[PDB]
Design a protein around this ligand. Sequence first.
Ligand SMILES: NC(=O)c1cn([C@@H]2O[C@H](CO)[C@@H](O)[C@H]2O)c2ncnc(N)c12
Ligand SMILES: [Zn+2]
Ligand SMILES: [Zn+2]
Lengths: 114, 301
Amino acid sequence: FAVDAAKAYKDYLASGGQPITNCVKMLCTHTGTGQAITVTPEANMDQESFGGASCCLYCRCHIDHPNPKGFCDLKGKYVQIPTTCANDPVGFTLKNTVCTVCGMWKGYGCSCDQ
Amino acid sequence: SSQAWQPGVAMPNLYKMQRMLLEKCDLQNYGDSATLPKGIMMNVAKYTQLCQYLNTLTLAVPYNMRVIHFGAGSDKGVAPGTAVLRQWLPTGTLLVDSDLNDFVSDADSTLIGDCATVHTANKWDLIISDMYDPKTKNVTKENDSKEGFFTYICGFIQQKLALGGSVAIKITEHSWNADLYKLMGHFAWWTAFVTNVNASSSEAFLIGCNYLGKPREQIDGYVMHANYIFWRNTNPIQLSSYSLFDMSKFPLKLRGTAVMSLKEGQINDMILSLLSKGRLIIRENNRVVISSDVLVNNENL
Ligand SMILES: NC(=O)c1cn([C@@H]2O[C@H](CO)[C@@H](O)[C@H]2O)c2ncnc(N)c12
Ligand SMILES: [Zn+2]
Ligand SMILES: [Zn+2]
């Protein structure tokens, strides 16, 4: 037995629940590389940059991280979120995946399959 | 007025030289609010302007820099100020933060508890504090120097700030401490800095730049706070978020400032001069180890 927080938030959102708020949006140039998860803000024109911890479902809900290591991919880093999705950064990070070669979000920057 | 395009306003030197009596703080712009960029929190804007101002000083910035941030939690359970500090500081800087109340942070390590419980083996290159108790804002009682976490801060600086290091400690009209002002005379330079986004508040950051470990100047902290209030009372500051829109030069330059370990008898005037210029840090370069004291109680039957 183990709580499945990810699924719960996804279902809560589909049920019409209000997205997790108070994610920490950063001031930046918006001329960055546009990669998904970086050591400093890297939003491009089409993105917002957020402090990573505040966008991590596990950090924010005080629950163990989905990793035998329990390491947090986002804490201490910055996450770039497409501006069109920046109303729900936590949902975005959960529902999406980072291309492991170019560092962009699959479908929101990753041009590797071209 | 030029000022609106700065990150904020620092207390002009002539005001520091006065001998004013403490009065009530009555700000003309009290109730004004700056227009923050869309979706940006006050605490992000405020820390951004603080860091933009610190970029103009002669901060020591060594490799393996160590920064500690007190009062870093929010009622929202996140740490916006820590997120700005980590953006500003060189990658790899060791950042520790703390607060009385639980929060999640981008710091490398976070301690939850009264600051008085926080201990560290190592010395630090930069101390930031936003600790504050809004109960101090009581206009019906005399405004005397406060103790509490300010007593901790003064001791922590004297015991754990590296020579050459700097501090930025948040104060307000009622949240202040006379010894902390006196301790500003132990730095090569000091000021009280008001962010332009929060200029409608009596808040400032008391900044001590390049710690010398001894008095360079004898400051009476009761008089200095009265001087600070006199400045605020007679110099309205226009609310402004202008500086937030240009982040191209935001990152703190990694200067690679030298770190040396020296004993009291070794701090000559040439060393003191290097310290004063932001060119030297004096501390052990050992591993960073911190802890929080935990009071144990058993209240069964
Ligand atoms: N003595 C005090 O009143 C304190 C207020 N804060 C924090 O300062 C921050 C800004 O008000 C809040 O997040 C508080 O939890 C503190 N954090 C640590 N230790 C303290 N003694 C305090
Ligand atoms: Zn996390
Ligand atoms: Zn790719």
